[PDB]
Amino acid sequence: RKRQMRNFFVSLMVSQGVPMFYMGDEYGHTKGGNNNTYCHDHYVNYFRWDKKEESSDLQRFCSLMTKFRKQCESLGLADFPTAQRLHWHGHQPGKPDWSETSRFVAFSTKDETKGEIYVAFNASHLPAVVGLPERPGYRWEPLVDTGKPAPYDFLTDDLPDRAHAVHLFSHFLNSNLYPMLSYSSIILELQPDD
Amino acid sequence: CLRYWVTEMHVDGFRFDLASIMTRGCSLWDPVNVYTTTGTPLATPPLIDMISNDPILGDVKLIAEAWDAGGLYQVGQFPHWKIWSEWNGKYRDIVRQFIKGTDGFAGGFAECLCGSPHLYQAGGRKPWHSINFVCAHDGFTLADLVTYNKKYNSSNGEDNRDGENHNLSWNCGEEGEFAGLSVKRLRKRQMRNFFVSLMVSQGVPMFYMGDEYGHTKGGNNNTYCHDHYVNYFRWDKKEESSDLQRFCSLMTKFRKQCESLGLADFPTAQRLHWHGHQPGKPDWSETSRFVAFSTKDETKGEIYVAFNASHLPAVVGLPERPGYRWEPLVDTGKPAPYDFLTDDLPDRAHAVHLFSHFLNSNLYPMLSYSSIILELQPDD
Amino acid sequence: ARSCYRFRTDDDGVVDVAVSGEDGGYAVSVEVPGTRGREGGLVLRASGSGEGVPLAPAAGGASLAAELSFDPTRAPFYLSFLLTDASGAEIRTHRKTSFRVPVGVGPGSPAPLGMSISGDGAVNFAVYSKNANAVSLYLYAAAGDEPALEIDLDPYIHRTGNVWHVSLASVDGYVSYAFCCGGIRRPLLDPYAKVIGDFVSSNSMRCFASLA
């Protein structure tokens, strides 16, 4: 459930357009299962600040996602993207699968600030190891992985163990690979390797 | 002579070179002499009978290299009296072909891991009568096994005629010591895989001087005539390769600590279970390059071993044991010192924690040409 | 003449024992070198003894030594003991046994088979038996019918392969010897004896090898 909620927020924050979400969705407000609450002057419809501190991890994830959307200029585009800037990939780079059984959508796009970002969604029930695009002289650095436990689902310089966390995945990242769970999303940034 | 060495120099055992010659018949049994010619192999040679049943020599270690240069080949059929051990060359061939990646060697590999009962059980010998080895003084070293596809014996002066011609090796992508970073990483992985395969097999493991730091002979696979540093132990180069040496020491310690690794009898089906990509479904097909098993341990509870000799990475499912979880110990793909986890590592708990999202759901991601070992621990 | 025994321990170490025929008692000295895993001294308990003989430093902490003495008239016997650190943990042999050492007999040599005498006058016994799990030596005096001396052989020190051997300083006061294999107390004849005794049908069929 936590994975899927993070996936929904990632998809909202990486789509072209204007993101929009109702209050209380940044920390997981529950109504008991009631989808039509137009006639309740009850605590079900009141924002809970007692339970906000219990869901600080999801709130931090949402705030970091919004900040990342602000910092990336390839997300706010006045015109529609063209094939030169946006490329589609599948399990292997440059081979998207559009069939009826497909549950894997991934793309990579260029940026003047971040250089390049890679986004992948795995809606399948089977974990997979994906092949990252081949960029001579560079490498891919993990930023977001909805499967990882907090606070490592979002990597920031505020973390004291960021470099060690990247080092413990370097053996997969050195061969342009990344292991993914089922129902999970990843975002990577391209960085020079010299 | 053998009794003299045992009783005066306190030698614990012997290894016989070209031992098949000691089974060939003597010319004294030709019908011309008494009243089947010279050199015909015998089923009960008198010398082997005298050695096996000697009051002193019968209780020491006897190992035979069961072939000669006259065409004899007696691996698995040496006259043993249930006492004699053998250099297992079939193990060498099968492991060399499986680890480098070759179709049709998964079943042979699984048989090798169990001590080769198909060669020893029927005759009444035990798993430890098999002397397992990957490399020896003759042939390639462990480092040259992953660097050269062919011998380079021109320094011998015999125009490359001498030496074994079918080495069953793979240069991991490029020929020679000058290669890219990925090729060198793969070579280090493959040496670790060979040592892991050696150290988790039933039987007696044996490896050659200097294979623990990656000694190289330059591709020369027959170096009998060089009093030269190509044949010397390099104590200076050993310090530049402390990671591989540490890995080998830790793996030997692990073998010593487990009671399910060196067994006095052949493993039964109640203790050992075979797995595949999914638990309980081993793949013995011709295209298979994946062997995994789990065995019950009276000391560590349960251990799980997997070999991925494929060129494709895979995520494998782990056996389901409610109330317990699997803990990572060995991973030949990881950079040192995280290829082997010890409590001397200050980052052990954190490194384990960073793989919890995979370990919780009984999964593990593997590189191509890698190996893993995991242990079962209570979780409540 | 002194005898020396070196035992490997179960914690990757060495215990050295020496048995000396002091000019009519016996002195046994125990020396434990090395220190990696145990620091705070050791006590020699005689295989579960409630008492103890602490080991004292010898040459500056490199080795710990102790000494035990035994009164004469004692027929050949075995000294068994264990070691303990200052934690309660017990040090055993690498075969997981108490350290057992013979007092009154030597280890002997496996060749030649039978009874032989060395230049100094030591008497060596050697007999082959693959199937027997226990071998004992009997000595008889001029009459005998029952053994004057009985010596059990240690399965570790008094064997080389499948040959049981033992050495004796002197056989004075004895004329015959025999062997007992397994737990059966029936005296057997040495197959390699050169001089034998009288065939006596006891109330049985027994013959003893001569010590001359």
Side-chain angles (χ1 to χ4, degrees), chain B residues 38-246:
Chain B
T38 326
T40 302
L42 302 170
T44 304
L47 170 73
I48 308 305
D49 197 15
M50 272 164 89
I51 291 167
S52 318
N53 291 297
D54 192 76
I56 285 159
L57 302 176
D59 225 15
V60 311
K61 267 114 197 170
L62 309 160
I63 307 148
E65 165 182 84
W67 60 75
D68 56 48
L72 223 42
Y73 192 80
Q74 298 176 332
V75 169
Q77 327 168 276
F78 192 80
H80 43 82
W81 271 267
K82 286 154 183 46
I83 292 294
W84 274 80
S85 315
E86 263 154 66
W87 272 29
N88 198 341
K90 303 183 182 270
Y91 177 100
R92 196 249 323 258
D93 278 324
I94 286 155
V95 174
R96 272 179 187 206
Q97 279 161 117
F98 178 82
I99 290 297
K100 87 187 168 55
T102 301
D103 274 354
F105 282 97
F109 188 69
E111 228 153 1
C112 271
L113 288 154
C114 288
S116 309
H118 60 309
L119 297 167
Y120 299 105
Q121 189 166 27
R125 281 189 286 189
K126 293 294 182 322
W128 40 268
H129 286 101
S130 195
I131 312 291
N132 303 334
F133 72 107
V134 168
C135 294
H137 75 90
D138 54 76
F140 276 155
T141 66
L142 191 66
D144 290 346
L145 194 48
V146 306
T147 315
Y148 303 96
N149 278 351
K150 98 167 154 213
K151 76 184 173 202
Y152 296 87
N153 287 15
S154 162
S155 34
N156 293 27
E158 307 177 40
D159 302 298
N160 259 272
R161 291 201 290 300
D162 67 300
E164 157 86 65
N165 285 284
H166 308 322
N167 294 284
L168 306 167
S169 59
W170 180 44
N171 57 17
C172 288
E174 307 187 5
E175 186 94 349
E177 213 96 350
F178 312 115
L181 260 279
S182 50
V183 169
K184 311 204 129 292
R185 283 187 229 119
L186 178 50
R187 286 174 173 158
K188 304 198 288 229
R189 269 216 304 286
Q190 290 281 72
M191 314 189 54
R192 276 161 177 83
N193 296 324
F194 274 125
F195 219 82
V196 162
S197 165
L198 205 65
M199 269 318 138
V200 304
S201 278
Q202 310 292 335
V204 178
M206 167 198 291
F207 60 96
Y208 181 61
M209 167 165 93
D211 277 357
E212 71 262 20
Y213 69 81
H215 184 83
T216 174
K217 275 171 195 180
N220 197 310
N221 82 319
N222 188 42
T223 322
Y224 75 103
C225 56
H226 299 109
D227 185 48
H228 168 262
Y229 64 78
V230 81
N231 275 135
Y232 295 171
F233 192 102
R234 301 294 299 261
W235 301 92
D236 55 344
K237 285 202 228 169
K238 191 212 63 183
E239 298 272 287
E240 308 178 358
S241 294
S242 46
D243 41 306
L244 187 62
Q245 204 256 339
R246 171 196 179 256

Side-chain angles (χ1 to χ4, degrees), chain B residues 200-344:
Chain B
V200 304
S201 278
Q202 310 292 335
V204 178
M206 167 198 291
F207 60 96
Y208 181 61
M209 167 165 93
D211 277 357
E212 71 262 20
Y213 69 81
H215 184 83
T216 174
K217 275 171 195 180
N220 197 310
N221 82 319
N222 188 42
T223 322
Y224 75 103
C225 56
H226 299 109
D227 185 48
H228 168 262
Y229 64 78
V230 81
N231 275 135
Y232 295 171
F233 192 102
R234 301 294 299 261
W235 301 92
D236 55 344
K237 285 202 228 169
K238 191 212 63 183
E239 298 272 287
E240 308 178 358
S241 294
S242 46
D243 41 306
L244 187 62
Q245 204 256 339
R246 171 196 179 256
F247 183 86
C248 298
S249 310
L250 291 165
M251 270 289 297
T252 316
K253 195 164 145 193
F254 181 73
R255 179 188 183 83
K256 181 202 232 264
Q257 262 158 17
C258 299
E259 72 98 18
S260 63
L261 281 201
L263 289 175
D265 321 280
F266 287 103
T268 76
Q270 323 300 314
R271 164 206 292 281
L272 203 149
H273 298 104
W274 297 105
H275 312 283
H277 277 25
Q278 293 313 89
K281 295 133 201 260
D283 183 17
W284 310 120
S285 145
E286 163 88 2
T287 39
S288 183
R289 325 205 156 167
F290 190 90
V291 171
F293 73 90
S294 90
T295 165
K296 316 239 195 80
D297 209 24
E298 262 308 299
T299 311
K300 318 236 171 198
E302 202 164 340
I303 86 180
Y304 173 91
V305 192
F307 294 89
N308 183 33
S310 156
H311 75 275
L312 291 184
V315 166
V316 311
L318 308 182
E320 294 274 349
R321 311 268 175 271
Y324 301 77
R325 50 137 37 201
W326 293 100
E327 231 53 54
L329 185 71
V330 169
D331 188 337
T332 66
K334 282 219 234 301
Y338 295 97
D339 57 328
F340 207 118
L341 295 187
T342 61
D343 267 313
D344 302 345

Side-chain angles (χ1 to χ4, degrees), chain C residues 120-144:
Chain C
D120 47 16
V123 188
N124 191 81
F125 297 88
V127 62
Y128 158 80
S129 198
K130 186 151 103 115
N131 112 93
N133 88 282
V135 172
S136 198
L137 174 69
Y138 290 177
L139 295 201
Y140 302 87

